[PDB]
């Protein structure tokens, strides 16, 4: 139920260049129940990182998860362009839980 | 290989009800497997809907999908029905169903498994 | 050991013959083929 912003609304940068990205919340403070997500229209969302601390199956390296407090951070090291799309923070410690709005990076 | 096949996407009418599912190709809901159901609407920010135990048999709603819908599911087959009565305008959009891949009681805490959604309209 | 086989407690001089010596297993493995396809068999049995 923690009400997450993600953090810049819009990016454009050139591609190759290093990214970071931030989500923020209110609620009850967990770190390592977060995940990141990125969804291409017309296909389902794939996820990035799980828990703020490990990689899923075939992420490459470029993700990279960071922060210690209630923040939750990633980072980007090189912006191949087939990266141009929405992220989003999900946490499961709390009650019925909720999204966020989304950051769309372009071109 | 484990990948989530979904129904395909559907017309209905105002003032009746929906059953929803999906599958699995070689994936089974088992003891310790759970998933949760996600919609997406156009160009709108997603939604949780809810999750389900298939052993204990415990399921978690939203506060405002406490009236509507029902979650069951039946180990055996494995599958997943979705009962969701009067669909308005408002419910027309691609649900998901997400589980991760866990067998043994030994799977992480992200849902890796993705289904392609049935994009539901009711005129 | 060659008290123990002999069922005496003084052994004579000689030369005696004991247990084997052998080689213990390490570890296990298994390969069955790879499919995982789940066999049609709700379709024979719930046919109507
Ligand atoms: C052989 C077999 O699997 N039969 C099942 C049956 O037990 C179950 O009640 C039904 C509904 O899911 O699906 C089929």
């Given at each position: 139920?923690?009400?997450?912003?993600?953090?810049?609304?819009?990016?454009?940068?050139?591609?190759?260049?290093?990214?970071?990205?931030?989500?923020?919340?209110?609620?009850?403070?967990?770190?390592?129940?977060?995940?990141?997500?990125?969804?291409?229209?017309?296909?389902?969302?794939?996820?990035?990182?799980?828990?703020?601390?490990?990689?899923?199956?075939?992420?490459?390296?470029?993700?990279?998860?960071?922060?210690?407090?209630?923040?939750?951070?990633?980072?980007?090291?090189?912006?191949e362009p087939e990266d141009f799309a929405v992220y989003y923070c999900q946490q499961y410690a709390?009650?019925?839980?909720?999204?966020?709005?989304?950051?769309?990076?372009?071109? | 290989?484990?990948?989530?096949?979904?129904?395909?996407?559907?017309?209905?009418?105002?003032?009746?009800?929906?059953?929803?599912?999906?599958?699995?190709?070689?994936?089974?809901?088992?003891?310790?497997?759970?998933?949760?159901?996600?919609?997406?609407?156009?160009?709108?920010?997603?939604?949780?809907?809810?999750?389900?135990?298939?052993?204990?048999?415990?399921?978690?709603?939203?506060?405002?999908?406490?009236?509507?819908?029902?979650?069951?599911?039946?180990?055996?087959?494995?599958?997943?029905?979705?009962?969701?009565?009067?669909?308005?305008?408002?419910?027309?959009?691609?649900?998901?169903?997400?589980?991760?891949?866990?067998?043994?009681?030994?799977?992480?805490?992200?849902?890796?498994?993705?289904?392609?959604?049935?994009?539901?309209?009711?005129? | 050991?060659?008290?123990?086989?002999?069922?005496?407690?003084?052994?004579?001089?000689?030369?005696?013959?004991?247990?084997?010596?052998?080689?213990?297993?390490?570890?296990?493995?298994?390969?069955?083929?790879?499919?995982?396809?789940?066999?049609?068999?709700?379709?024979?049995?719930?046919?109507?």
């Open positions: 139920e923690i009400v997450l912003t993600q953090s810049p609304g819009t990016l454009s940068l050139s591609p190759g260049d290093r990214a970071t990205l931030s989500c923020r919340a209110s609620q009850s403070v967990r770190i390592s129940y977060l995940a990141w997500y990125q969804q291409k229209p017309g296909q389902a969302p794939r996820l990035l990182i799980s828990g703020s601390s490990s990689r899923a199956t075939g992420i490459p390296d470029r993700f990279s998860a960071s922060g210690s407090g209630t923040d939750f951070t990633l980072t980007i090291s090189r912006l709390n009650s019925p839980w909720t999204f966020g709005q989304g950051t769309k990076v372009e071109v | 290989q484990m990948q989530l096949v979904q129904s395909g996407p559907e017309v209905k009418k105002p003032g009746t009800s929906v059953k929803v599912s999906c599958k699995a190709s070689g994936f089974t809901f088992t003891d310790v497997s759970s998933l949760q159901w996600v919609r997406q609407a156009r160009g709108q920010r997603l939604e949780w809907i809810g999750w389900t135990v298939v052993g204990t048999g415990n399921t978690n709603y939203a506060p405002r999908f406490q009236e509507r819908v029902t979650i069951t599911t039946d180990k055996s087959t494995s599958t997943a029905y979705m009962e969701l009565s009067s669909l308005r305008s408002e419910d027309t959009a691609v649900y998901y169903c997400a589980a991760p891949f866990c067998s043994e009681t030994s799977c992480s805490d992200g849902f890796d498994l993705w289904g392609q959604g049935t994009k539901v309209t009711v005129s | 050991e060659t008290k123990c086989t002999l069922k005496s407690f003084t052994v004579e001089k000689g030369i005696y013959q004991t247990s084997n010596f052998r080689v213990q297993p390490t570890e296990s493995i298994v390969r069955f083929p790879n499919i995982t396809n789940l066999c049609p068999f709700d379709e024979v049995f719930n046919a109507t």
